[PDB]
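Bug report (template v2)

What were you trying to do?
Predict the complex of my protein with zinc ion.

What happened?
Run completed; filing so the output is reviewed.

Input:
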Amino acid sequence: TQGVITWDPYEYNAQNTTLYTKDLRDSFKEVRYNIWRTADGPESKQTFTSQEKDRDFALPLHLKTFHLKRGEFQIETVGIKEDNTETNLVTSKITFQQHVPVLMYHAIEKFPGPSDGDYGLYVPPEQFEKHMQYLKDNGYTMLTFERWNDINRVNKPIFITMDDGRKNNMNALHILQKLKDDTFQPAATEFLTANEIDKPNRLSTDDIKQMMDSGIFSIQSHTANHTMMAHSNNYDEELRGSKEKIEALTGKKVIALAYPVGSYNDPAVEETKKYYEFAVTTDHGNHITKGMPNEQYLIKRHFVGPNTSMEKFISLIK
Ligand SMILES: [Zn+2]
């Protein structure tokens, strides 16, 4: 209950910092740091002692000691005076941002086409189950934006997203429901294009109530009319109106957007910012929180489709 823990600024992808303890009224000869990874968690713990003083008990921390695993780390400090008595100083948290892949699916059906959409949109149910089982077999934690803050608090975080709200997405629910067990708790996000709800080949209101009632799905916005936002300025109908339509259906808060076609620019982000906490793109790559401005409205996603080999799929979620 005494003092405060500070550290040296680092960049998002850095592996090292020097953290030091400050503002103690009593005078100490050394400080002991008890540090552990929130995910692993307290049972895994490592102690480092800074006999180093004059420089506020600086400690050079490098993730190599933690095997370069990343995320949130907890720090407990205890001060040892000239008399060898011990005093509990303060608890802190330091975070080293972790990469999170976000997979973009669309239809979970065998291609019947052309019909609705191109072949690239249609992952057969068997392929999708193989992906989901792989995440089950390799200890992935599936997250949605209600749990955004946990990416640095869990092992192997991953977001599984689906765009458009196509009716064959109920096959995805069943696939997830059947893999649901005491060990594996699945979560996914569905982005509805609002004005297509209860249209042919789109999820029904009952479809959504079911997906919502399983505890697996987060229901979010895909715009009202699958509009390309960089080329539109009807923000009100497409951003705000879409959100309120879904919200009036679900009864749950809508906080995330997925730009149709991946189309966006600065004015559309500034307008998205007014109505959403997160927005997701089709920009290729993993997501990392780098500290960039508005970066939570430009989240990078991976395209997964019928021609995605398992080997490549695996390379994506590495
Ligand atoms: Zn779409």
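What did the reviewer find?
The CA atoms of residues 39 and 154 lie 5 Å apart. The radius of gyration is 23 Å.
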